[PDB]
Amino acid sequence: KAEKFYSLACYHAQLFSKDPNTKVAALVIDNNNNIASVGYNGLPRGFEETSDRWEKPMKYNYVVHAQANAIATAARNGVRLDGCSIITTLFPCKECSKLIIQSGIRKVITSKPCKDSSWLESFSFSNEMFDECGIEVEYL
Amino acid sequence: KAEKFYSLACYHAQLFSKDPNTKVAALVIDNNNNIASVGYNGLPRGFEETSDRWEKPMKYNYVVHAQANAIATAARNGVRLDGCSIITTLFPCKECSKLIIQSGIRKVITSKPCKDSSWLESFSFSNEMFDECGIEVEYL
Amino acid sequence: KAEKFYSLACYHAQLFSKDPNTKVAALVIDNNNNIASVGYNGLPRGFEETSDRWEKPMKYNYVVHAQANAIATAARNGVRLDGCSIITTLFPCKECSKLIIQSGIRKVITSKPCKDSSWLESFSFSNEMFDECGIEVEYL
Amino acid sequence: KAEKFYSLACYHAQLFSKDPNTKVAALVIDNNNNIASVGYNGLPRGFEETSDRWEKPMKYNYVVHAQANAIATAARNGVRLDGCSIITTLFPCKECSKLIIQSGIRKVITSKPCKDSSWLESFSFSNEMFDECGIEVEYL
Amino acid sequence: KAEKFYSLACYHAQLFSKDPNTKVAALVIDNNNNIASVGYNGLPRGFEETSDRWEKPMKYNYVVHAQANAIATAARNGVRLDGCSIITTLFPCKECSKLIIQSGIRKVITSKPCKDSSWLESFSFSNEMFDECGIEVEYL
Amino acid sequence: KAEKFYSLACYHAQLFSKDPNTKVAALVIDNNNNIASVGYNGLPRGFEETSDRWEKPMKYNYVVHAQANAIATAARNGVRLDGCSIITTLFPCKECSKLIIQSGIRKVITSKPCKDSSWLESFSFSNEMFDECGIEVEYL
Numbered sequence A, B, C, D, E, F: 001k002a003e004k005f006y007s008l009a010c011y012h013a014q015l016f017s018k019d020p021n022t023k024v025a026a027l028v029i030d031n032n033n034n035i036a037s038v039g040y041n042g043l044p045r046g047f048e049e050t051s052d053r054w055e056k057p058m059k060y061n062y063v064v065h066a067q068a069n070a071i072a073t074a075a076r077n078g079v080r081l082d083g084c085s086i087i088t089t090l091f092p093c094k095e096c097s098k099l100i101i102q103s104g105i106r107k108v109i110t111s112k113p114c115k116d117s118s119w120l121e122s123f124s125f126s127n128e129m130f131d132e133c134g135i136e137v138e139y140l
């Protein structure tokens, strides 16, 4: 079932993300296997999504990461994430890892990141916080 | 009443924030003047808060901004932030401004930032997004 | 966006439904485009899903329709469906149409059923109730 | 207390059900003895309740069973039924038994059905599913 | 329908209230005619209900009014009473009228009190607050 | 942390209570240290707060105690108080103690009342109910 939700997350990113280079999605799943929240990378709701705003490097001033978006969207909708799992198409960055912990998510399910030395430091900080704060990491 | 909640936010930061240099808090207030969520700057819940982890520059690897924390805490608790106002002791950074929009908060109430040219760019991006996405900014 | 959610519904049915002949799913979507509930056709939760129980005609004694399941699952989870839309891979039967009305769903989005005279009566009753009770039907 | 709620269910059916032959009601009660949801047999909300539509056999095209209605009404209102008990004036049919399981109700309290051979098969299927899926049946 | 709910309230009081002299109940009904909360007069939950504690005048040290109980029970269960109506077997006392206003209830439905000069002052204060604060009073 | 919330309660009363003699506030805090509800002593919402209505003895006809207000406000907002703690600037009166029990609050945190023989009876009844019903009292 974890793999089926991961497959759905991949499809979500392909269908909904407007990023022209890299589409990312995350599903927050509760203990009854209900989809509590969905995030995908994008610009803020209602912000005019011009071609110029989605080019690099300009898009980084406006874009929201998928996992951050899943959490912020749950706050908007008033959906409780404490105890849930997050199934994401990309292992979280350092800042999203903090928000994952703060939202009460207890488990991250994703694929193993490709070896990239520029991300080793960030990856190490995320896993240090996850290990200490009780967040399980499961790689498909 | 906005000023009374801002006063309470200042007291919240002084009482609860462990940052040795700068304490920050934010109250998310609904349309019935109920406190929907509180954030303050800090390390993730349960992360060992050693002296070394709170020193600069190391603390930036672990710290969560107050306004981000208010939103992530609402997602943990399942509290609906759509339509609420956020009363904060510090005008939000560019990334927290994105999360504020995504959480459905409609209004930011704070004090006017001091002139700081290193923050002009960030301040301009936050206000560009707020203006376009319908977030009112009110300075006390 | 309606077509993207319909595509996801089709994928949901293919991934999760255990019916060996016909897989059905339905997504209940709220006015902020959040997935409030998912249903797919299946046997009751925890009921032993033997090969014999999934054969015809025996499976009809135990199977739950996808749209009924979406509504019953929302009641289990305490998710409010009033005002939502249901995007389904199959136009609802007469009994599911009643439950759709009772759950407060205001709109059915699906594909146009193929001409089948054995279902004309049922289809006519569903649309009579939908028309009178204020449920919009939209065909992709 | 179970008998007092059953008495109230009987009164609910007599007061609210428009069926001219048989009035049915069900109360879904949580573990704090709060009434989470009420169902009674009837036509869909807002459907014109003409004399012709309530005659037999025409009414079966439009009527909703009380226990199904209790569950669909909870989905409309966003009331969590997981772990609740359902106190009903009539033992559930095969289809309502499926929905009871799917809604997370853990216990059915009613009176013992009168001997009726035409319902033996249905009664046997309901109890087979209840026994296997963990639903307790208590007869007053 | 208001009269049918009032009839149910009377039955609730007769079935559940342990007061040996006067049994009182109140139903808080939302705009979809769902029973949001029930109160009846009684001693606090789990307090040993001895014969001595239910005698007069001792019982007044421990008893909770039905309408107060309906509101406190909703707070325990987390049920939103804003905009609801309260259907009560007895017109509220001065203190319960305050709590009714504070809970967001917008309408009181009951029977007309019998002429009792010892209650004229209290009745006048309740209606002064109701009139000014926007609470409609409807007598059956 | 209990003392920090008590300090905030004192500030809440000073900022928001309009009583010219004695300002009272109470914070209901959940097990994640989120502020579930706030009460302070005052007149009903929207009632014209004239100088005459706030004088003694007239104000007692209209005023609501802080702890009662915290509970009634939670019912208005639909916030679950079961299992929470109430941190109050004043030990509850006999009637508020009943409502505290009925709302599911499990713990009262306040300062020790000053010796006042006119309140001994009331204080004794509150503590008798708290002891029997499982409410812990903690004095700072």
Ligand SMILES: Cc1cn([C@H]2C[C@H](O)[C@@H](COP(=O)(O)OP(=O)(O)OP(=O)(O)O)O2)c(=O)[nH]c1=O
Residues within 6 Å of the ligand: A016, A038, A039, A040, A041, A042, A043, A044, A045, A046, A047, A049, A064, A069, A070, A073, B102, C032, C033, C034
């Ligand atoms: C609906 C939805 C949006 N989001 C995020 C993605 C984007 O950053 C932002 C808005 O999504 P968009 O798909 O951009 O939607 P929009 O409301 O901006 O409308 P439009 O199609 O006209 O652009 O919110 C989620 O993370 N989860 C959701 O379920």
Ligand SMILES: Cc1cn([C@H]2C[C@H](O)[C@@H](COP(=O)(O)OP(=O)(O)OP(=O)(O)O)O2)c(=O)[nH]c1=O
Residues within 6 Å of the ligand: A102, B016, B038, B039, B040, B041, B042, B043, B044, B045, B046, B047, B049, B064, B069, B070, B073, F032, F033, F034
């Ligand atoms: C309780 C609470 C915490 N937070 C944030 C602040 C911190 O970053 C984090 C945890 O707060 P801390 O005060 O650090 O609490 P803790 O659970 O880590 O316990 P301890 O006192 O032993 O350290 O969550 C909020 O933003 N709002 C809240 O209401």
Ligand SMILES: Cc1cn([C@H]2C[C@H](O)[C@@H](COP(=O)(O)OP(=O)(O)OP(=O)(O)O)O2)c(=O)[nH]c1=O
Residues within 6 Å of the ligand: A032, A033, A034, C016, C038, C039, C040, C041, C042, C043, C044, C045, C046, C047, C049, C064, C069, C070, C073, D102
């Ligand atoms: C999780 C889930 C289940 N259902 C329905 C489908 C089935 O009829 C029933 C249970 O789904 P199943 O996929 O059968 O899951 P299960 O809990 O029975 O476990 P197992 O995999 O061991 O069989 O609930 C939904 O409609 N929506 C949902 O989101």
Ligand SMILES: Cc1cn([C@H]2C[C@H](O)[C@@H](COP(=O)(O)OP(=O)(O)OP(=O)(O)O)O2)c(=O)[nH]c1=O
Residues within 6 Å of the ligand: C102, D016, D038, D039, D040, D041, D042, D043, D044, D045, D046, D047, D049, D064, D069, D070, D073, E032, E033, E034
């Ligand atoms: C209010 C309510 C309705 N129902 C069901 C019964 C019916 O099938 C349907 C609507 O109930 P009805 O009593 O028919 O109410 P209505 O909204 O159709 O209005 P009218 O009196 O003009 O007919 O919903 C419940 O199961 N539980 C409830 O609490």
Ligand SMILES: Cc1cn([C@H]2C[C@H](O)[C@@H](COP(=O)(O)OP(=O)(O)OP(=O)(O)O)O2)c(=O)[nH]c1=O
Residues within 6 Å of the ligand: D032, D033, D034, E016, E038, E039, E040, E041, E042, E043, E044, E045, E046, E047, E049, E064, E069, E070, E073, F102
């Ligand atoms: C269940 C319930 C209780 N109450 C009130 C009535 C009483 O004052 C108090 C508890 O109700 P009681 O009927 O006394 O129940 P209890 O939990 O004390 O158990 P026992 O039967 O052993 O005495 O809560 C409501 O107002 N509404 C409700 O829905």
Ligand SMILES: Cc1cn([C@H]2C[C@H](O)[C@@H](COP(=O)(O)OP(=O)(O)OP(=O)(O)O)O2)c(=O)[nH]c1=O
Residues within 6 Å of the ligand: B032, B033, B034, E102, F016, F038, F039, F040, F041, F042, F043, F044, F045, F046, F047, F049, F064, F069, F070, F073
């Ligand atoms: C907002 C709020 C009010 N209350 C109580 C205090 C008062 O008795 C009542 C209303 O509070 P007031 O501060 O009087 O507010 P109001 O809505 O009457 O507006 P105004 O300032 O014009 O008078 O509700 C709480 O207990 N908690 C809360 O969080």
Ligand SMILES: Cc1cn([C@H]2C[C@H](O)[C@@H](COP(=O)(O)O)O2)c(=O)[nH]c1=O
Residues within 6 Å of the ligand: A019, A021, A022, A023, A024, A040, A041, A042, A056, A063, A064, A065, A066, A067, A090, A091, A092, A093
């Ligand atoms: C690194 C990272 C990027 N993203 C988003 C930001 C951008 O929209 C996109 C990456 O764009 P890029 O591949 O052109 O650099 O993916 C996430 O959602 N999460 C992450 O962890």
Ligand SMILES: Cc1cn([C@H]2C[C@H](O)[C@@H](COP(=O)(O)O)O2)c(=O)[nH]c1=O
Residues within 6 Å of the ligand: B019, B021, B022, B023, B024, B040, B041, B042, B056, B063, B064, B065, B066, B067, B090, B091, B092, B093
């Ligand atoms: C800039 C900024 C900092 N903070 C936090 C991060 C740090 O804990 C602290 C600033 O530390 P510093 O003053 O030593 O740089 O304030 C916020 O919460 N929000 C903000 O917008």
Ligand SMILES: Cc1cn([C@H]2C[C@H](O)[C@@H](COP(=O)(O)O)O2)c(=O)[nH]c1=O
Residues within 6 Å of the ligand: C019, C021, C022, C023, C024, C040, C041, C042, C056, C063, C064, C065, C066, C067, C090, C091, C092, C093
């Ligand atoms: C007709 C219908 C069937 N179904 C389910 C029941 C069965 O599991 C399956 C149909 O099986 P069949 O194609 O072998 O008859 O689809 C629905 O979920 N909704 C419907 O409206």
Ligand SMILES: Cc1cn([C@H]2C[C@H](O)[C@@H](COP(=O)(O)O)O2)c(=O)[nH]c1=O
Residues within 6 Å of the ligand: D019, D021, D022, D023, D024, D040, D041, D042, D056, D063, D064, D065, D066, D067, D090, D091, D092, D093
């Ligand atoms: C068999 C059954 C019927 N009903 C309803 C449907 C009809 O409105 C009524 C039975 O009508 P009848 O007695 O004329 O056949 O009771 C239920 O609510 N639940 C059941 O389990």
Ligand SMILES: Cc1cn([C@H]2C[C@H](O)[C@@H](COP(=O)(O)O)O2)c(=O)[nH]c1=O
Residues within 6 Å of the ligand: E019, E021, E022, E023, E024, E040, E041, E042, E056, E063, E064, E065, E066, E067, E090, E091, E092, E093
């Ligand atoms: C006056 C009043 C009494 N009651 C309760 C308190 C007692 O249990 C009972 C009255 O008892 P009595 O008739 O012996 O005086 O009714 C309410 O619930 N609401 C009210 O408004």
Ligand SMILES: Cc1cn([C@H]2C[C@H](O)[C@@H](COP(=O)(O)O)O2)c(=O)[nH]c1=O
Residues within 6 Å of the ligand: F019, F021, F022, F023, F024, F040, F041, F042, F056, F063, F064, F065, F066, F067, F090, F091, F092, F093
């Ligand atoms: C005794 C008591 C008073 N109060 C309020 C009622 C009045 O507004 C105020 C007391 O006014 P006083 O000090 O002039 O008598 O405090 C509470 O909120 N809780 C209590 O337990």
Ligand SMILES: [Mg+2]
Residues within 6 Å of the ligand: A043, A044, A045, A046, A047, A049
């Ligand atoms: Mg957009």
Ligand SMILES: [Mg+2]
Residues within 6 Å of the ligand: B043, B044, B045, B046, B047, B049
């Ligand atoms: Mg900490």
Ligand SMILES: [Mg+2]
Residues within 6 Å of the ligand: C043, C044, C045, C046, C047, C049
């Ligand atoms: Mg199964």
Ligand SMILES: [Mg+2]
Residues within 6 Å of the ligand: D043, D044, D045, D046, D047, D049
């Ligand atoms: Mg009707």
